[PDB]
Amino acid sequence: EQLANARRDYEAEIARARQEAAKIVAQAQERAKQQEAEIIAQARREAERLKEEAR
């Protein structure tokens, strides 16, 4: 039972580590994506204002 539970604990906690790593990368990606969305929005608005002034 010690052998079996050692294997189970190792695999389960490695899986938990992988899952929390997935959460870390996911939240970092979400922050990067929303910041990128803001950047693209302001760039598009700058382009539109410049287009109005060019007209």
Place this chain on the structure above:
Amino acid sequence: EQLANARRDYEAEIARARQEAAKIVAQAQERAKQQEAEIIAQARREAERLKEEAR
């Protein structure tokens, strides 16, 4: 001796699992830092391209 090595392997496997989970979170943090850094950089490059095509 079977029980002794099984117990020692149980705690040692937990320890090595924590070492590898530390490596896993380090890799995940490196990936997150990277991914966000060049996501912001690519947002900057896309804004620059938007300004260039507007000009």
Place this chain on the structure above:
Amino acid sequence: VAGKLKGELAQFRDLAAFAQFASDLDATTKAQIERGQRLQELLKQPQYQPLPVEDQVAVLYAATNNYLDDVPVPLITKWRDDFLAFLRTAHPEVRKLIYDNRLDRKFPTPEVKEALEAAIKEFKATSN
């Protein structure tokens, strides 16, 4: 990269009926059926989303070097899309490395085979 793709797809096209309702096949015919379905799902691409040469090279390298075998059939388009997103973000240096030496006679250089297989392994372990 594409010779193995073309050959495997041709073999799968030859093996048509067996895939679809012959159930008494070994894992020699069925292996080709599986791999051909993998590759065919790989070619399913949306509209207005072209892939540069390094992207297709990386995806077909992953598919033809057995790195995609464990992926189930319906999820392969999402696997390709996720691997590309990982490749844009997690490792742009490997994309640059593929694109720089796409013209050499022996493309799978050890510098390229490394840091591409490494990226594939990283994506496989991190995701699913």
